[PDB]
Design a binder for these strands. Structure first.
Ligand SMILES: [K+]
Ligand SMILES: [K+]
Ligand SMILES: [K+]
Ligand SMILES: [K+]
Ligand SMILES: [K+]
Ligand SMILES: [K+]
Ligand SMILES: [K+]
Ligand SMILES: [K+]
Ligand SMILES: [Mg+2]
Ligand SMILES: [Mg+2]
Ligand SMILES: [Mg+2]
Ligand SMILES: [Mg+2]
Ligand SMILES: [Mg+2]
Ligand SMILES: [Mg+2]
Ligand SMILES: [Mg+2]
Ligand SMILES: [Mg+2]
Ligand SMILES: [Mg+2]
Ligand SMILES: [Mg+2]
Ligand SMILES: [Mg+2]
Ligand SMILES: [Mg+2]
Ligand SMILES: [Mg+2]
Ligand SMILES: [Mg+2]
Ligand SMILES: [Mg+2]
Ligand SMILES: [Mg+2]
Lengths: 15, 53, 251, 119, 68, 216
RNA sequence: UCUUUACUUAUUCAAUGAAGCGGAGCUGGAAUUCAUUUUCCACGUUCUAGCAUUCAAGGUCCCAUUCGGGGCUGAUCCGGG
RNA sequence: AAAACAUAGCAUUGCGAUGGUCAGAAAGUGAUGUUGACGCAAUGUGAUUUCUGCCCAGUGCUCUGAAUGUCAAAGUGAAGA
RNA sequence: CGUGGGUUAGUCGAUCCUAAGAGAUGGGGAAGCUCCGUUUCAAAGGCCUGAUUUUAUGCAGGCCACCAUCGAAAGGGAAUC
């Protein structure tokens, strides 16, 4: 899966 | 089409096995056989060398 | 007069090579530690047509020694190499067709191809379909192999210069007649703008040394000095002799 | 000597100071170049424009050529105290920009047009 | 002062001392860019007789040009 | 211990990916590093004429230490000390003399008692003449690892030369003992050093190549 | 004056992500201790279209043990050509 | 619009990269060349079949051919303030 | 001819991508207008993650380093009836 999607999930968990 | 693979769940894009949506079943079978047999023959190669020593 | 056809070629505008469909330059691996001191094994993954070229190419994959990755080379396929075959390249590789050995490390009489002129040039001699070089001698003091080239020239090269064992594939290509203008058309479509060719005597004087006259004819000797200048070198340049060769050309 | 695992030398990372100017780039900041009174130039009151007020609940304005759809929405809310559903725009053949602004169902285009005072 | 000695030395361009410095320096300059700032004069005596002073605002550039 | 196992890698040709080794020897350095290294080489591979080659000999660490000991007693007045001295407006000062033009003039007048010449002046012609001149005028001179060191002696960044014209009677014998040492290595060897060409040193690999032809 | 030939730093050509050059060792092997070591040769990969990456596991020493961290070795030394 | 050009076929010439042919005012510059003699470059003749004679004096091209004819600048010798 | 009206898009195009090609920079030529060359004989960058909760930059770590840019309304291409 693309980096932009991976980064989105990572922000979602950082909250 | 390539970008449609982004919209669909992982079960559409894979199968449940080593190398799922990448290599076919018979290709995976050859990889396993070859890995097993060559790694064994390597043990024999070393022992035959270690005897001659 | 005007600038003749043979002088227009150097500007390289409509006369450049037609390279869209080519696979990449055929070349040996870069000469590195592994090849100088041992051997490295690669796999022949594909054997593939290159546009413009007679001989097929072989895509050989080797592991990188210093980084976890694969490195596809593009070799010119020797006759007999097959997909899946392992290829061994280096000082210590064995004497089998497809392997890449330094010329010091092969006996007199070995047939090789894609031989380097200087060590690490990555291949130079005997690359066209059906050609090869013969090793004819070693000079281990001077570190110099002697070799016979396709032309029949003998040549002394460094013993560190590498070659591939065997003959370039696709041989016997030029035995089949082309038959039709069209076949030559398609041949040159994938090479460069060299065809068809108007004869100089069919032109006017402005266009060629041979042009003009109330009959088509050359009118002065067609043999031209090596010291002639651009615009004059048309015909037979620096010819030692001329006329039909009654005999064999071999030394 | 220090260990170098690559054979490549790259330019060292070095401190980069932010500007700390001895005098302001310009004296006074420019006032807002596209305030609400600039974004909306005037209503369009052709008979066909007026049909859209009466029926479609659409106001039709001339609008600054520099104005995008975000700025038009914001200007209309501000100047007329109304809620915008969507904005469609075009550049007319005379080189001015026309905006077709549909209001939400809570507001009536004919009332609001009567207030701003073109019927 | 030194500058008198420097003046007289620089006249002996085929002396062994000056042949050697000429060889080392010509090589070094050929390695740098065709125009490059010089940190200071290589001929400080020569520079000062042509008007240079060692003040902030005087600058030396070295340049090569093709002969012939 | 029982879970843990010894799995040694084979880093021979064609085996495991090589490990990260120290490649310092192979680094493609910036051009300026290359220039400064190759300049040091070239100036020793070439035959170096005596007037330059004499600068290769320098005052040994113990004597240099003892010299700087002495000269540090006669440091010139700093900017603060001057500001003080001018409010009072004072006695005769004893200070190390510096400035290439100044010192060259002092040597010509036979006022200098000891001259120190930096070994690393660039351009060299600023000082190639000094040994000869000091020799001609009968002035003790030492070539010293300096420029920057002589700078520190004189509250400058660099200095090129430094000299003593007067010492205090305290340190007259110190100077004299030091001059005797210094004369041994420089002025007294001057006429021999004048004849000997420097340079012609081969690099590491060419030396080995020369040594393997010597025994044969 | 000519021919042949040394040197390497200028100059020239070529290559690479400037990765393993040169000299010594260690280790064996053969040879040969012809008392004695002088040398010489190698110095981890060849049935097979698999796999090879995380400062390396191991070994060892420090740390303050703990979730860990660091060094040395593993992978000889020397010259930074 | 042809009987001309092209053409397949035939033959000759040059060249092994420090190269041939060709480009650029120059260049740390270019085309052939992502090339390497079964190739690139330069010419002639013009499918197949059959054949392709004699002349190297001339002009040209070419030659590890003889040398002491001719023979620039620099250099060398003599005369001369 | 005179006077007005008329072209509404997240989904159609452009915009993005690369093609033959064009073209800055590093450099080198050229009296110079400029020419070469396009990854080179350059010290050529910009991501990830945690935090810290001092703040969205230094710090903590890591990670990889190719070489600007322009060039298709018929090529490639997220989504409407
Ligand atoms: K054509
Ligand atoms: K023709
Ligand atoms: K003619
Ligand atoms: K002919
Ligand atoms: K004749
Ligand atoms: K003739
Ligand atoms: K759009
Ligand atoms: K398009
Ligand atoms: Mg033809
Ligand atoms: Mg005609
Ligand atoms: Mg003519
Ligand atoms: Mg005619
Ligand atoms: Mg003619
Ligand atoms: Mg629109
Ligand atoms: Mg300054
Ligand atoms: Mg007609
Ligand atoms: Mg015809
Ligand atoms: Mg015929
Ligand atoms: Mg003459
Ligand atoms: Mg009208
Ligand atoms: Mg679309
Ligand atoms: Mg340009
Ligand atoms: Mg574009
Ligand atoms: Mg399209």
């Amino acid at each position: 899966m693309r980096a932009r999607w991976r980064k989105k999930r990572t922000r979602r968990l950082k909250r | 089409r390539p970008r449609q693979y982004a919209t669909v769940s992982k079960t559409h894009k894979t199968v449940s096995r080593a190398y799922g949506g990448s290599r076919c079943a018979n290709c995976v079978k050859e990889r396993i056989i070859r890995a097993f047999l060559i790694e064994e023959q390597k043990i024999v190669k070393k022992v035959v060398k270690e005897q001659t020593e | 007069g005007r600038v003749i056809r043979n002088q227009r070629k150097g500007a390289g505008s409509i006369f450049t090579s037609h390279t869209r469909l080519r696979q990449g330059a055929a070349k040996l691996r870069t000469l590195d530690y592994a090849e100088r001191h041992g051997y490295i094994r690669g796999i022949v993954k594909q054997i593939v047509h290159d546009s413009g070229r007679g001989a097929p190419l072989a895509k050989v994959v080797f592991r990188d020694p210093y980084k976890y990755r694969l490195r596809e080379e593009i070799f010119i396929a020797n006759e007999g190499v097959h997909t899946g075959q392992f290829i061994y390249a280096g000082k210590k590789a064995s004497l089998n067709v497809g392997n890449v050995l330094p010329l010091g490390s092969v006996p007199e009489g070995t047939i090789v191809s894609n031989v380097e002129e200087k060590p690490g040039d990555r291949g130079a001699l005997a690359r066209a379909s059906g050609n090869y070089v013969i090793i004819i001698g070693h000079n281990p003091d001077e570190n110099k192999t002697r070799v016979r080239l396709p032309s029949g020239a003998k040549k002394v090269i460094s013993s560190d210069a590498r070659g591939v064992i065997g003959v370039i594939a696709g041989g016997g290509r030029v035995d089949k007649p082309l038959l039709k203008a069209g076949r030559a058309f398609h041949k040159y479509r994938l090479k460069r703008n060299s065809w068809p060719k108007t004869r100089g005597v069919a032109m006017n004087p402005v266009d060629h040394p041979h042009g003009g006259g109330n009959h088509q004819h050359i009118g002065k000797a067609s043999t031209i000095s090596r010291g002639a200048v651009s615009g004059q070198k048309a015909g037979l340049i620096a010819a030692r002799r001329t006329g039909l060769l009654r005999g064999s050309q071999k030394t | 000597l220090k260990v170098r695992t690559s054979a490549t030398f790259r330019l060292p990372k070095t401190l980069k100071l932010a500007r700390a100017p001895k005098y302001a780039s310009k004296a006074v900041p420019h006032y807002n170049r596209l305030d609400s009174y600039k974004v909306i130039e005037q209503p369009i009151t052709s008979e066909t424009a007026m049909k859209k007020v009466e029926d479609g609940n659409i106001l039709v304005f001339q609008v600054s050529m520099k104005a995008n759809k975000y700025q038009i929405k914001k200007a209309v809310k501000e100047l007329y105290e109304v809620d915008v559903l969507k904005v469609n725009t075009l550049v007319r053949p005379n080189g001015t920009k026309k905006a077709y602004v549909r209001l939400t169902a809570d507001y009536d285009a004919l009332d609001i047009a009567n207030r701003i005072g073109y019927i | 002062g030194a500058y008198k000695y420097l003046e007289e030395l620089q006249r002996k361009k085929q002396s062994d001392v000056l042949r050697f410095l000429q060889r080392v320096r010509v090589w070094e300059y050929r390695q740098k860019n065709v125009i490059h700032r010089a940190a200071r004069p290589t001929r400080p005596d020569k520079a000062r007789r042509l008007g240079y002073k060692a003040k902030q605002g005087f600058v030396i550039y070295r340049v090569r040009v093709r002969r012939g | 211990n029982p879970l843990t196992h010894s799995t040694p890698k084979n880093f021979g040709i064609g085996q495991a990916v090589q490990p990260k080794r120290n490649l310092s020897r192979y680094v493609k350095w910036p051009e300026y590093v290359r220039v400064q290294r190759q300049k040091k080489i070239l100036s020793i591979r070439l035959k170096v004429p005596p007037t330059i080659a004499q600068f290769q000999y320098t005052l040994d660490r113990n004597t240099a230490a003892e010299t700087f000991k002495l000269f540090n007693k006669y440091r010139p007045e700093t900017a603060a000390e001057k500001k003080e001295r001018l409010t009072k407006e004072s006695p005769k000062p004893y200070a190390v003399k510096y400035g290439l033009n100044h010192v060259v003039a002092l040597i010509e007048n036979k006022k200098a008692k000891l001259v120190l010449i930096a070994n690393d002046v660039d351009p060299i012609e600023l000082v190639v003449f000094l040994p000869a001149l000091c020799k001609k005028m009968g002035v003790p001179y030492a070539i010293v690892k300096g420029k920057a060191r002589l700078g520190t002696l004189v509250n400058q960044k660099t200095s090129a030369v430094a000299a003593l014209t007067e010492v205090r009677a305290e340190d007259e014998a110190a100077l004299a003992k030091l001059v005797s040492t210094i004369d041994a290595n420089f002025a007294d060897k001057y006429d021999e050093v004048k004849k000997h060409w420097g340079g012609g040193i081969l690099g590491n690999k060419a030396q080995a190549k020369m040594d393997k032809r010597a025994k044969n």
